Design a protein around this ligand. Structure first.
Ligand SMILES: Nc1ncnc2c1ncn2[C@@H]1O[C@H](COP(=O)(O)OP(=O)(O)OC[C@H]2O[C@H](OP(=O)(O)O)[C@H](O)[C@@H]2O)[C@@H](O)[C@H]1O
Length: 205
């Protein structure tokens, strides 16, 4: 079972970040033949049904699978979170404020809170900042981690008014490249909320 946890992690890294360094033949849409991946050293211990299990029982739908042809087999991608340049990846462009989700919200942790207040939310390594289109139940909402302590909400219409684009992934995640350096500046911060161990509001600028 942990092997499924290990399979997902190895799948996440290879499909999101390390593929052109691993030799895999990935297209500009982020799709790679699954067999060529399962031929890699770290993947040689897994079966196409193991990967199939991880793809369907995954609650965040991190990976998409496509039939392909028999000469290539199944095509497998990650839906979001890429360090690689995949310009043709399936993304819904949220170009007007009326297409945006009800609320944009990023959940993070105290260790990073002072840097976010002073520099803004950063893409960090990834190509897009990851936001949720809502808060979760007592919930696994995709686009947000599970053990977050504080959540900060984003003013979507104001960011768009300043030419900061937004995108929706095929698994419900909202993405933005930020500004030039990959930062969502603290001006587009509308509201903040501490989540654990008690729901309390947090102050900003
Ligand atoms: N200026 C700043 N200074 C200091 N820290 C800053 C900062 N700006 C942001 N940070 C924080 O630095 C980390 C970012 O780095 P990351 O992108 O890898 O973290 P994330 O949570 O966004 O992860 C994305 C998806 O990836 C996973 O999806 P999976 O389930 O693994 O498939 C997740 O669940 C998500 O859905 C976060 O803590 C940021 O708050």
């Amino acid at each position: 079972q942990d092997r499924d946890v290990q399979l997902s992690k190895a799948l996440s890294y290879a499909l999101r970040h390390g593929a052109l360094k691993l030799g895999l033949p990935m297209g500009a849409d982020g799709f790679v033949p699954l067999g060529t991946l399962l031929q890699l050293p770290q993947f040689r211990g897994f079966s196409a049904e193991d990967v199939q299990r991880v793809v369907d029982t995954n609650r965040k739908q991190r990976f998409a699978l496509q039939l392909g042809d028999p000469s290539t087999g199944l095509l497998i991608r990650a839906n979001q979170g890429h360090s690689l340049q995949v310009p043709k990846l399936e993304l819904m462009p949220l170009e007007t404020p009326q297409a945006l989700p009800p609320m944009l919200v990023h959940g993070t942790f105290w260790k990073h809170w002072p840097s976010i207040l002073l520099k803004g939310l950063s893409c960090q390594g990834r190509t897009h900042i990851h936001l949720a289109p809502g808060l979760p139940g007592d919930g696994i909402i995709s686009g947000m981690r599970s053990h977050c302590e504080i959540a900060v909400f984003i003013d979507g219409p104001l960011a768009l008014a300043d030419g900061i684009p937004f995108f929706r992934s095929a698994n419900g995640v909202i993405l933005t490249p930020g500004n030039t350096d990959g930062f969502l500046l603290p001006k587009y911060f509308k509201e903040a909320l501490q989540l654990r161990p008690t729901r309390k509001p947090l102050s900003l600028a």
